[PDB]
Amino acid sequence: LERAEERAELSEGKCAELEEELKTVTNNLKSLEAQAEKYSQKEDRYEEEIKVLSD
Amino acid sequence: LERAEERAELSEGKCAELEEELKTVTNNLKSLEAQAEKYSQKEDRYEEEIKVLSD
């Protein structure tokens, strides 16, 4: 039980660590979703600067 | 013990679920990062072209 509880604690430790990493990565995912979209928009703002400059 | 073990299984189960959620968001982050980076690279290509056309 102590070892199983220890495993629960170690696994919970990992669970929490992964959760923290999950959230960090997910938060990065979200900032990156925002960046991938802002960047796709920049891909267009810059493409537009090229089109405008081309004109 | 069944509970300590259940908790070992539950916390291990959940930490494994988080490993999968983490890998999923990590891979989505890598995808969005790669996407954002492909866009940042396009932004740079345009910036290079913006500088070329601006100049």
UniProtKB/Swiss-Prot annotation, chains A, B:
The modification Phosphoserine is found at residues 11, 31. Disulfide bonds: none annotated. It is found in: Cytoplasm, Cytoskeleton. Detected in primary breast cancer tissues but undetectable in normal breast tissues in Sudanese patients. Isoform 1 is expressed in adult and fetal skeletal muscle and cardiac tissues, with higher expression levels in the cardiac tissues. Isoform 10 is expressed in adult and fetal cardiac tissues, but not in skeletal muscle. It comes from the Eukaryota. Changing residue 5 to G: In CMH3; no change in homodimerization; decreased in hom odimer thermal stability; decreased in actin binding; increased calcium-dependent regulation of myosin binding to actin filaments; dominant effect in the homodimer. The molecule is in a coiled coil structure that is formed by 2 polypeptide chains. The sequence exhibits a prominent seven-residues periodicity. Binds to actin filaments in muscle and non-muscle cells. Plays a central role, in association with the troponin complex, in the calcium dependent regulation of vertebrate striated muscle contraction. Smooth muscle contraction is regulated by interaction with caldesmon. In non-muscle cells is implicated in stabilizing cytoskeleton actin filaments. Homodimer. Heterodimer of an alpha (TPM1, TPM3 or TPM4) and a beta (TPM2) chain. Interacts with HRG (via the HRR domain); the interaction contributes to the antiangiogenic properties of the histidine/proline-rich region (HRR) of HRG. Interacts (via N-terminus) with LMOD2 (via N-terminus) and TMOD1 (via N-terminus). It is linked to Cardiomyopathy, familial hypertrophic, 3: A hereditary heart disorder characterized by ventricular hypertrophy, which is usually asymmetric and often involves the interventricular septum. The symptoms include dyspnea, syncope, collapse, palpitations, and chest pain. They can be readily provoked by exercise. The disorder has inter- and intrafamilial variability ranging from benign to malignant forms with high risk of cardiac failure and sudden cardiac death. Belongs to the tropomyosin family. This is Tropomyosin alpha-1 chain. The lineage of its organism: Eukaryota, Metazoa, Chordata, Craniata, Vertebrata. The gene is TPM1.
